Structure formats: structure tokens, C-alpha cells
């Protein structure tokens, strides 16, 4: 146990050993077997972690002095025995990373650091009389263990996110991000690993580990904040920026081929434009993917949020290369629906419809349809959507002033200087008035929303929230304001709403009721 471990450690680091070296080297197989037997059988020993750390230090000293560097004459068993013990320690570390029932925090979370420090020191300590950093075999074995290491259900976290494997999360914390070369060599070994058939039939499966590996805005190809190096001599790894981007492109598309689940579908759609689309040589390859995500018409009831998420990447792709989605404003008119105000992603869509409806080549009937439908949607809505709908209607009416007949029709005004025949005609036409707005029309220009009027905002002027009602008072106020800073009005939530309500500007004193609800308190007492 700990006694034999510390004695064998002192013997291995003492001066030299041959038979005791053989015993303390074959003892690591026994330590691996004991940990593999106690896996989900003891789960609290820490002698296993001490044995891994001690065998790491012993093999580190053995790779310092007696490594399998080269040979001159008749040392044809010492190098084979030392490399055999080092390869068995590495294979035990890879089995230790692959075989773990759950987040046991020792057998994988220390074997990862063991294989990482082993390859980090084994950059040198070979025949390489140059500037190599060749871990490639050990690294390919590391990542195939890291993707075979399936835990219980923390992969594909069915609420949101990517994967909650503890050692993979620690890897993307401090063993993937903080440098340049090991992520590049990871992408290269990944895009060699996805080409032999058995490994690719296993590697298109657990994609969530890779989503957790990538969605972090801290890549070596991303020029926002760049890194340093820990490896002694990096072998033209940072040079081929084309090779990193091309590898990133092809493994992205090749594992986007495989077993799309809806949660990680929405995850890659949300990160599609701000995270990965600059790291593509040709981003037109994703155009088919997000155009079918945009016109996704599925029977699944939560498959109505994915057009709203495909819009950002698809519009950035159109803008960078002017490709066309036909019937664009018809599809954008049918995308607004009562789901879109109750959805989680409102500000992400409305800060894009800011750009879509500011176009100088569209019609007053089109903007009329887009605000009359939005008002009939906003009459049954949270204030989170009220306070982003009504300044949007303000800015659209301010940019298309012909749409102020929906707020103010001058044919329905009774001034005191009128003919009796005029007030007669006024009474007959306001009795023979019916509004022509039809919600089931698919065409914005063919919707009669200019010929209709806009009652929903006037009804909205009496709202339970004072800030919301005083914001809706501006449609009876004049229009001296030019615009409203929609990105300042956008993401007001229930939580931040009552946060600012508890942390408001002044503080009046509360009052009491003189109503005396003595017996009947509600109508329910």
C-alpha cells in the first residue's frame, strides 16, 4: 500500500535499480488492476492517486536519465525495457482516463494530467536532434480515450449546454485554451482520426464533448486575444494558419453530418455566427445547412424556434456574400407569431429585425403589416416583449410616416365647423366601417393593414405597470423624438424588471385601504 509505495519510490529514486526497478515497474500494473477492480467498488482510496503520482515521478526520472533515446553497442535490452515500462505506464494512464464510472475526480482527472505531463516532457527525450514536439501517437491515443470515456448522462445535457464530463471540462479550461499548438495538433489528429472507419463510426456519436471543447471564443485562429506557449520547440504548428482553419472547417462539417439532437442543434445555431463562421475558409458550405434550418418546417412542437436562430448566421452569410433567399419578407412575416414573444430569444431577433426593416426599398403596406401583426401579437404578451415592441413601432412609424394613418385617421374627426351633411356622412361611414386586416394572409403587401387601424396600442395604454403604460402614452404624445436606442430598450426581463422595481429611483411611503374587507376578503374567502 502506502508503505510499499513510498519504499519503492525511495528505491526507484535512490541511485539505480535493476531487479528492484523490475519489481517497482511491474507494481504499476498491479496498481492499475487494483484501481480497475475498485472502480465503482471503493471510490475513496487516494492510494490509487498516490500510486499514479509516484509512478509518474518514477517514470519521469527514468525518462530523464535512462530513456529510449538512442543506442551505441549492446544496450539492446535496456532501451526496450525502459520504453516498455514507459509505454505500459502510458497505456495504464489511457485506460485510467477511459475507464471511470462517474466524476470520481482521481482516476481520470489525474491520469489526464499524467499523460499530458508525460507527453509534455516527451516532446524532447527521443532521437529528435531538432525542433520537434512530436507527441502525435500519444496524443491520438489520449483523444481516443477522451472520447471513449463515456460517463452516465452528463454527455448531451438534455436541458442546454454541451457536455458535463468533468475531465473534458477541465481539459477545455486549462489543457485546450491557454496555448496555440496543442489545440492545432488536436484538430489535426481529430481530422486524421475521423477518417478510419471504426473510429469515425464512434466519433460522430458523442459530439457534445466537442461542442464543450469549441464554444469558447478563445481559438488560435480568432484574433481577439492570443496566447503563449509551454512546449519547448513547436514544430511549425502556429505557422500553417490555413491548415488549422481547413481542419476546423472539415471536422465541423463532418461531425455536423452525424446524429443531430435538437439541443445541440440549437446550440450550434446560436453559436453559428459569432463563434465559428469567421473560422471557415469557405463559409458558403454552411449555407445549405442554415437555409434548411431557416425553412425548417417540422412536426416537432419546439421546432419553431430554429428559424429564429438560423436568421443571424444566414443574414451574415448573405451580407458577406450576397446570396438570396427568395420571398424573404414573406418568410419574415410568417416567422412572427405568438410563440416569438413568449420565446427565450427575443432581443437576438429584434436586433436583427432592426436591420431588416430599416431597408429603404420596401413598402408602406409591408411596414403596416409588420406592425399591425406585431400589435395583435403584443396584446397577449409579457412586458419583456411590450417594452421592445412599442419603441419598434415608434421607429418604424417614424421612418415610414405614411403608417401614421393607423394611429390617426383624420376622416373620423368631428370638428365644430362642420356641415350638418358632413356630420351626417360621418355618422353613416363610422357605422358602415369594418376593418380589413386579416391575420391569415401570408403576404405582407396583400394584408390590408394600412387600410385597417391600430387599436392594440391604445388598449395597451392602460397597463398594470406604470413604466409600461407611460411608455405606451407616447402614441398619444407627439413625435418629437427621433429614435429610441432599441438595444437599450431590448432585454428587460421579469427578474431585472422587479430588480429595478425594488431598486427604483425614489421611495414613497405605502398607503392603506379604507375598504374594510372583513368577512369576504376576495371573492374566494
Amino acid at each position: 500500500d502506502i508503505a510499499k509505495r513510498l519504499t519503492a519510490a525511495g528505491d526507484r529514486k535512490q541511485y539505480n535499480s535493476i531487479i528492484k526497478l523490475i519489481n517497482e515497474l511491474v507494481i504499476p500494473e498491479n496498481v492499475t488492476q487494483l484501481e480497475e477492480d475498485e472502480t465503482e467498488k471503493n471510490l475513496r482510496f487516494l492510494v490509487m492517486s498516490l500510486f499514479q503520482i509516484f509512478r509518474k515521478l518514477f517514470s519521469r526520472g527514468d525518462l530523464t536519465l535512462p530513456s529510449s533515446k538512442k543506442s551505441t553497442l549492446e544496450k539492446e535490452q535496456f532501451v526496450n525495457w525502459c520504453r516498455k515500462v514507459y509505454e505500459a505506464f502510458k497505456t495504464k494512464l489511457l485506460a485510467i482516463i477511459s475507464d471511470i464510472p462517474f466524476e470520481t475526480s482521481l482516476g481520470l482527472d489525474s491520469l489526464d494530467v499524467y499523460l499530458q505531463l508525460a507527453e509534455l516532457e516527451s516532446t524532447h527525450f527521443a532521437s529528435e536532434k531538432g525542433a520537434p514536439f512530436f507527441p502525435n501517437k500519444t496524443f491520438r491515443k489520449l483523444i481516443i480515450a477522451l472520447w471513449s470515456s463515456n460517463m452516465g448522462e452528463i454527455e448531451d445535457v438534455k436541458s442546454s449546454g454541451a457536455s458535463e464530463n468533468l475531465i473534458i471540462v477541465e481539459f477545455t479550461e486549462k489543457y485546450y485554451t491557454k496555448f496555440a499548438d496543442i489545440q492545432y495538433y488536436f484538430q489535426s489528429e481529430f481530422n486524421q482520426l475521423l477518417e478510419d472507419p471504426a473510429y469515425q463510426d464512434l466519433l460522430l456519436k458523442n459530439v457534445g464533448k466537442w461542442l464543450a471543447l469549441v464554444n469558447h471564443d478563445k481559438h488560435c485562429s480568432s484574433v481577439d486575444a492570443d496566447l503563449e506557449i509551454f512546449v519547448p520547440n513547436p514544430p511549425q504548428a502556429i505557422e500553417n494558419e490555413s491548415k488549422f482553419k481547413s481542419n476546423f472547417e472539415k471536422n465541423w462539417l463532418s461531425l455536423l453530418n452525424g446524429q443531430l439532437s435538437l439541443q445541440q442543434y440549437k446550440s450550434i445555431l446560436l453559436i453559428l455566427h459569432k463563434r465559428i463562421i469567421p473560422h471557415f475558409h469557405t463559409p458558403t458550405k454552411l449555407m445549405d445547412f442554415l437555409t434548411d434550418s431557416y425553412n425548417l418546417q417540422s412536426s416537432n412542437k419546439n421546432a419553431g424556434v430554429v428559424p429564429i436562430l438560423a436568421l443571424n448566421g444566414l443574414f451574415e452569410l448573405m451580407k458577406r456574400f450576397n446570396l438570396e433567399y427568395p420571398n424573404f419578407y414573406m418568410k419574415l412575416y410568417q416567422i412572427i407569431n405568438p410563440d416569438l414573444m413568449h420565446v427565450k430569444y427575443r432581443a437576438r431577433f429584434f436586433r436583427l429585425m432592426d436591420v431588416f426593416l430599416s431597408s429603404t426599398h420596401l413598402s408602406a403596406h409591408l411596414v403596416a403589416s409588420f406592425i399591425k401583426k406585431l400589435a395583435r401579437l403584443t396584446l397577449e404578451s409579457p412586458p419583456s416583449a411590450i417594452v421592445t415592441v412599442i419603441p419598434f413601432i415608434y421607429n418604424l412609424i417614424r421612418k415610414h410616416p405614411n403608417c401614421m394613418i393607423m394611429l390617426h385617421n383624420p376622416a373620423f374627426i368631428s370638428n365644430p365647423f362642420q356641415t350638418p351633411d358632413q356630420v351626417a356622412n360621418l355618422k353613416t361611414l363610422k357605422e358602415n366601417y369594418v376593418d380589413p386586416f386579416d391575420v391569415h394572409e401570408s403576404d405582407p403587401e396583400l394584408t390590408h393593414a394600412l387600410d385597417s387601424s391600430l387599436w392594440e396600442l391604445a388598449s395597451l395604454m392602460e397597463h398594470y405597470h406604470p413604466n409600461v403604460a407611460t411608455l405606451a402614452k407616447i402614441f398619444a404624445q407627439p413625435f418629437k423624438k427621433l429614435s429610441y436606442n432599441m438595444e437599450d430598450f431590448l432585454d428587460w426581463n421579469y427578474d431585472s424588471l422587479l430588480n429595478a422595481e425594488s431598486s427604483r429611483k425614489l421611495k414613497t411611503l405605502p398607503t392603506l385601504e379604507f375598504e374594510a374587507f372583513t368577512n369576504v376578503f376576495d371573492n374566494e374567502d
Binding site: 438570396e324 426599398h361 403587401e445
Partner: protein
């Protein structure tokens, strides 16, 4: 009278004393004006045709030329004598909003 180009028109020019060409949407249509009636329509673009103009009698193999500019980068030249067939085009570095010739 009224000529029902179905898309919202962006430009209307007059070629003959009789026929006029309206662009709007992905196509352009030509209309005989003595008979109130459409007779050609070319929809050879991806996005909306923003503008048109027309040339006559200039030193050219083409005796007449209608060129059309279309919000996707393209400006194309159509020959009114063989049924408004496209003969040449230029691609530009962004959406082309207006065009003209000498």
C-alpha cells in the same frame, strides 16, 4: 389604364414611343402601350432589379441596348431586337443600386 407588374416596381423607362419596360422584383417586363399588353419578361437575376436605362443608334453591333442593375452585383445588357436576350454582363463588388451609360 394601368399595367400590372406583380412585384413592386423600381423603375419604368420608355424604349419605343410604343413599348415601355418596367423593372421591379426579380424580373423586368415590357409592355406594348398601344395595346395595353405585356409581351416580354426576363427574370435572369437573383435579387430585385433596381434600375434600367436604354441606348439607341450609338456606334455598336447592337442597334439598341437595355441595361439592368439588380442588387446582387450584376448589371446586364439585353438586346431589344432579338426578344430582349442578354448579351453581356458585369459583376461588381456589392449590390448595385443604380446604373447608366453614355
Amino acid at each position: 389604364y394601368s399595367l400590372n407588374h406583380d412585384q413592386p416596381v423600381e423603375n419604368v423607362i420608355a424604349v419605343s414611343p410604343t413599348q415601355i419596360v418596367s423593372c421591379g422584383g426579380n424580373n423586368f417586363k415590357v409592355w406594348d402601350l398601344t395595346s395595353n399588353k405585356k409581351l416580354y419578361e426576363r427574370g435572369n437575376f437573383n435579387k430585385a432589379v433596381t434600375c434600367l436605362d436604354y441606348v439607341e443608334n450609338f456606334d455598336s453591333p447592337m442597334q439598341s441596348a437595355l441595361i439592368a442593375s439588380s442588387l446582387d452585383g450584376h448589371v446586364k445588357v439585353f438586346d431589344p431586337l432579338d426578344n430582349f436576350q442578354v448579351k453581356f454582363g458585369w459583376k461588381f463588388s456589392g449590390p448595385v443600386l443604380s446604373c447608366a451609360v453614355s
